[PDB]
Ligand binder design. Sequence first.
Ligand SMILES: CCC(=O)Nc1cccc(C(=O)c2sc(Nc3ccc(N4CCN(C)CC4)cc3)nc2N)c1
Length: 342
Amino acid sequence: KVYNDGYDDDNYDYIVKNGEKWMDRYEIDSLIGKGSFGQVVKAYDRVEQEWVAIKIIKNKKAFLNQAQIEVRLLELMNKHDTEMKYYIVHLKRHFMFRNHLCLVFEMLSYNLYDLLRNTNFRGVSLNLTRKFAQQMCTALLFLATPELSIIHCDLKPENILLCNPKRSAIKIVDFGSSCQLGQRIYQYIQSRFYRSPEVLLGMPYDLAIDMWSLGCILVEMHTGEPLFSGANEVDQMNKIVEVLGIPPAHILDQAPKARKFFEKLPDGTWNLKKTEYKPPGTRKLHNILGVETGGPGGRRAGESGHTVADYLKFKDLILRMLDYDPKTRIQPYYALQHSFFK
Ligand SMILES: CCC(=O)Nc1cccc(C(=O)c2sc(Nc3ccc(N4CCN(C)CC4)cc3)nc2N)c1
């Protein structure tokens, strides 16, 4: 009949109501988010006199525990002194309310997928993309702090929100999937479009996966379409090979799931399993970005800072981010010194 005295529903989470007032402080406006973890709502803090986004976790043990892990992480980040902290979303405070866990975040604006949908999926200028890229590389540089060593494990355009609708400042949200570096416990991680090959191949992984995701994002921010948009993992790997080529033999010799996509020939060489696709490595990123053809689809022809040189810097950096070897993949600190950011 009723659950938690009629406050929750079938899915253990709070039924939000327009204009409801909590604890004589927070004033609920409207639902803005919904996920497996629970719900996200827009509200007005009366004490700080400001708008905040509150994360209400479901009324279950599991979700509560996960949320507590996440809270510990956020608090851990907020305790560090560097300005690099200001690219991670800020957890002002947290509390319990009617058997629910509530996380108080600063209210942010649109996520990047919204913007992309506003361009009719044509992407944005390279000048803006440079700014986004810079800030993101800074954030990943912060998360790599020895005492932190945090892997976001779920970087996608909808997890990057604007601070202000009229400024190019962004921030990273939802650290529920988050992970501090350590021994492997999970193997089905990251979003499918942004899942690093070492994960697709069932191999050990570190922070280098985030970088991979970032590489898939920036290009998508300029073209409007996902770089690799496979319906499944096979299609995904095929689409990654289609652009970057078949992985190094020394990589595939280590990969347990290597034979999910490949087969080993009698001469030791690896080849794709047939299931559609271009020959490996003939979908050149050079042609995808339209370096010498006036940008993606020729819609950036004649625009400021859209010369061949700029596109070549960009392409070099992106190819440094999509390195197959996690050991040789470009690191944030060196990424911030690229000619792209001059
Ligand atoms: C949309 C939220 C999301 O994808 N992940 C997420 C989950 C839980 C909390 C947060 C988070 O930190 C947020 S979410 C937020 N405000 C916000 C939430 C939702 C939205 N929209 C969601 C997408 N709609 C098409 C437009 C409005 C816009 C802004 N501020 C913070 N600080 C983000």
